[PDB]
Design a protein around this ligand. Structure first.
Ligand SMILES: [Mg+2]
Length: 174
C-alpha cells in the first residue's frame, strides 16, 4: 500500500526509518534525512514534528539526495500519505485578498505562472472545492511548497506560509 523509507545519508545509506501510515514524530529516531524511497503512495513529508516547518510532496520513486524532492535542509520529522480524490475531481478558487475577498479566479487546471495567467504573485485566500493541490513560492513549481488538502484557507498562514508569495500551483494526481 502506502510505504515510505527515510535514510540519514545520501544514496540510501545510514540509519533507516520506515512508515506505512501517518507518523507525527520520528525526530528521536532519525537525526537527518538525505535520501528517501517511496515504495507506494504519494506522501507529504515535513521538517518538524506534527506536520510543521518546510513540507514536500513525493510520489513513488527513488530520491538519493534531499535536493531530489526540492528539500531545503537535511531535517525531516513527520509524514502523512496524501489522500487523492477517488473520483479524480480537482477545482480551486484563488483570491486576491484574505477572507475570500477581492478578485477571484476558479480553475481545474495547473498553473505554472500565476503572473502570466492571473496577473498575481501573491494569493491571500483559497477554497479547494475539489481534490488536493500544492502552492509554490516560486514560478513553475520551484521553491517552498504548501499542501492544500483542506477545504478553506482564509489567510496564507492557513497553508503554512508566513509569506503571501505564491507564483505557481498544481494538482496532486495519481
Ligand atoms: Mg490520511
Amino acid at each position: 500500500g502506502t510505504k515510505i523509507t527515510f535514510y540519514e545519508d545520501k544514496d540510501f545509506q545510514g540509519r533507516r526509518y520506515d512508515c506505512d501510515c501517518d507518523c507525527a514524530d520520528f525526530h528521536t529516531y532519525l537525526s537527518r534525512c538525505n535520501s528517501i524511497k517511496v515504495e507506494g503512495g504519494t506522501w507529504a513529508v515535513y521538517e518538524r514534528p506534527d506536520f510543521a516547518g518546510y513540507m514536500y510532496i513525493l510520489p513513488q520513486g527513488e530520491y538519493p539526495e534531499y535536493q531530489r524532492w526540492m528539500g531545503l535542509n537535511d531535517r525531516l520529522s513527520s509524514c502523512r500519505a496524501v489522500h487523492l480524490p477517488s473520483g479524480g475531481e480537482y477545482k480551486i478558487q484563488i483570491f486576491e485578498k484574505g477572507d475570500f475577498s477581492g478578485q477571484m479566479y476558479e480553475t481545474t487546471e495547473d498553473c505554472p505562472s500565476i503572473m502570466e495567467e492571473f496577473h498575481m504573485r501573491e494569493i491571500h485566500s483559497c477554497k479547494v472545492l475539489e481534490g488536493v493541490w500544492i502552492f509554490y513560492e516560486l514560478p513553475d513549481y520551484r521553491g517552498r511548497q504548501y499542501l492544500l488538502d483542506k477545504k478553506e484557507y482564509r489567510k496564507p498562514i492557513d497553508w503554512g506560509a508566513a509569506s503571501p508569495a505564491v507564483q505557481s500551483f498544481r494538482r496532486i494526481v495519481e
